């Protein structure tokens, strides 16, 4: 059985990497690109963009570990142990080339410390819609004057005692579509059937407590990256945020100037944080186009 | 029944005002203070004080609206709306002098209007361990690189399709033990036995409920406050402030600097957010000598 379907043309496969059975979605041809989802989702974020971008490329989207189908990691959920798994199972499928990665929320950490360990691995990235972890991440509020904060729920999820999982537990559609309406502009895109398989999907007893061990790890992540952020990325980067609630608005674009010396971002006016979902149609155009001008099928 | 064991001398009691059943514990002789609770808790955490404020004080300790034994409010849960209760009940025991205010946490937040607005009718005030409602709580931080943020709990009370309650809801008792004790600096007061009695309490559905509509009306309080502050704070006023872990340090006195003309402030070393319970010998000396400056008993 799947969790979520498989696109035709597609194929649902797993490999071991470092002891870790990573579960992942593969089809077309040509270079590969790697697809990185984010939290309260997995590699079917990408499906839209799948089947497009599979007429050029060799398209690869993996579950991280301990969420959709994959194994929890055995070394740990910080940045720099998660980006190992990616990387060996990106270069399981293009050991000669190098690939492209794309990567949403969570994404975005757990694979920023291979590409900048790795850089000739790594065509061209394509970051969006959350912060690369370093300091800028203790400056956003707890609150604000028109309700709850957009990362309150990085405290919730680093909280100790098992506080996320045993609140959440028994009640966890109620608490992903409060979560995922909460960070969205356009709350229409998100059908009550697809909420019931995202939550089937993280309510499982290791994937519910894998979903907030990342946040456990992010202060870790945060003096990792401190240390690897001295060597700036030199490859084609580009950034896409929202431009309406729940989005990062112009913080994507200008954070990742401090990193990265070619970069060009973008800002998607009504759309929040689920640009696969809320803004499909032109998040997918400009991900293809990108990725377009660097050679493929 | 009671839901705290009440001390020797004194008595439980109700009073309605406006509508409103309110709940206190009373004792003691001359001039009166009133102490006003802080969320989590009730009436029960000023126990010990209690008894050695009533050798020189009438002393009177409510539950706030909809907490402990009280009654919800029937306006509602603002700052200004709640305090109007409070002025209320005191100056049925005090009508014709002006009486004292010790407050913690959100009993801060429901008595600052009414100190304001009845200045001739606050001898001494003093406050703890909560800022007051205005613009300076949407500067307090989500996610902190060391220990943990202090209000990232503001959003998680705040926010809609009653989020907080659906989710602690059969876990009450399990929840506060980890919200008590994660505010703390000397955990250890907080025995098994002491956690079971405040649970009970604010498990009751609508006290659940009541708890977290403070904080829905929280912007609303800020809102109100904005305007009431363009009035200085007369009386003599006292801060105190936890040190330690859970502990607003500096905050409580630079604050409430900008609300009051005569104020002194003090930061208890070791000593987290519960002060009455963490570190009772020097706060409880400290308020018996800031009250007893002025005439009593």
């Given at each position: 059985?799947?969790?979520?379907?498989?696109?035709?043309?597609?194929?649902?496969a797993?490999?071991?990497?470092?002891?870790?059975?990573?579960?992942y979605?593969?089809?077309?041809?040509g270079?590969?690109?790697?697809?990185?989802?984010?939290?309260?989702?997995?590699?079917?974020?990408?499906?839209?963009?799948?089947?497009?971008?599979?007429?050029?490329?060799?398209?690869?989207?993996?579950?991280?570990?301990?969420?959709?189908?994959?194994?929890?990691?055995?070394?740990?959920?910080?940045?720099?142990?998660?980006?190992?798994?990616?990387?060996?199972?990106?270069?399981?499928?293009?050991?000669?080339?190098?690939?492209?990665?794309?990567?949403?929320?969570?994404?975005?950490?757990n694979?920023?410390?291979?590409?900048?360990?790795?850089?000739a691995?790594?065509?061209?990235?394509?970051?969006?819609?959350?912060?690369?972890?370093?300091?800028?991440?203790?400056?956003f509020?707890?609150?604000?004057?028109?309700?709850?904060?957009?990362?309150?729920?990085?405290?919730?999820?680093?909280?100790?005692?098992?506080?996320?999982?045993?609140?959440?537990?028994?009640?966890?559609?109620?608490?992903?579509?409060?979560?995922?309406?909460?960070?969205?502009?356009?709350?229409?895109?998100?059908?009550?059937?697809?909420?019931?398989?995202?939550?089937?999907?993280?309510?499982?007893?290791?994937?519910?407590?894998?979903?907030?061990?990342?946040?456990?790890?992010?202060?870790?992540?945060?003096?990792?990256?401190?240390?690897?952020?001295?060597?700036?990325?030199?490859?084609?980067?580009?950034?896409?945020?929202?431009?309406?609630?729940?989005?990062?608005?112009?913080?994507?674009?200008?954070?990742?100037?401090?990193?990265?010396?070619?970069?060009?971002?973008?800002?998607?006016?009504?759309?929040?944080?689920?640009?696969p979902?809320?803004?499909?149609?032109?998040?997918?155009?400009?991900?293809?186009?990108?990725?377009?001008?660097?050679?493929?099928?």
């Amino acid at each position: 059985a799947e969790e979520f379907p498989v696109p035709n043309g597609f194929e649902s496969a797993y490999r071991e990497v470092d002891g870790v059975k990573l579960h992942y979605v593969k089809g077309g041809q040509g270079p590969l690109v790697m697809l990185v989802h984010g939290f309260g989702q997995t590699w079917y974020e990408w499906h839209q963009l799948m089947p497009e971008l599979a007429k050029r490329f060799t398209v690869i989207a993996p579950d991280l570990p301990g969420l959709g189908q994959s194994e929890p990691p055995k070394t740990g959920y910080s940045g720099e142990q998660v980006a190992v798994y990616l990387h060996k199972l990106a270069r399981q499928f293009s050991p000669d080339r190098p690939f492209d990665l794309v990567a949403h929320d969570i994404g975005i950490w757990n694979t920023y410390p291979m590409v900048v360990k790795n850089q000739a691995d790594i065509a061209r990235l394509v970051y969006m819609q959350a912060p690369i972890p370093d300091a800028r991440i203790y400056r956003f509020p707890a609150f604000t004057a028109q309700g709850e904060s957009l990362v309150w729920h990085f405290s919730f999820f680093a909280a100790d005692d098992r506080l996320a999982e045993t609140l959440i537990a028994g009640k966890e559609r109620f608490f992903l579509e409060h979560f995922i309406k909460s960070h969205a502009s356009n709350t229409e895109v998100f059908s009550e059937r697809l909420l019931d398989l995202y939550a089937r999907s993280y309510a499982k007893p290791h994937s519910l407590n894998a979903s907030f061990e990342y946040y456990r790890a992010l202060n870790e992540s945060v003096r990792q990256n401190a240390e690897l952020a001295k060597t700036r990325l030199q490859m084609p980067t580009m950034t896409l945020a929202g431009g309406g609630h729940g989005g990062m608005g112009t913080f994507q674009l200008e954070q990742m100037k401090a990193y990265a010396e070619d970069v060009e971002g973008h800002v998607l006016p009504g759309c929040g944080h689920w640009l696969p979902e809320e803004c499909a149609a032109p998040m997918n155009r400009l991900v293809i186009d990108f990725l377009s001008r660097g050679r493929h099928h």
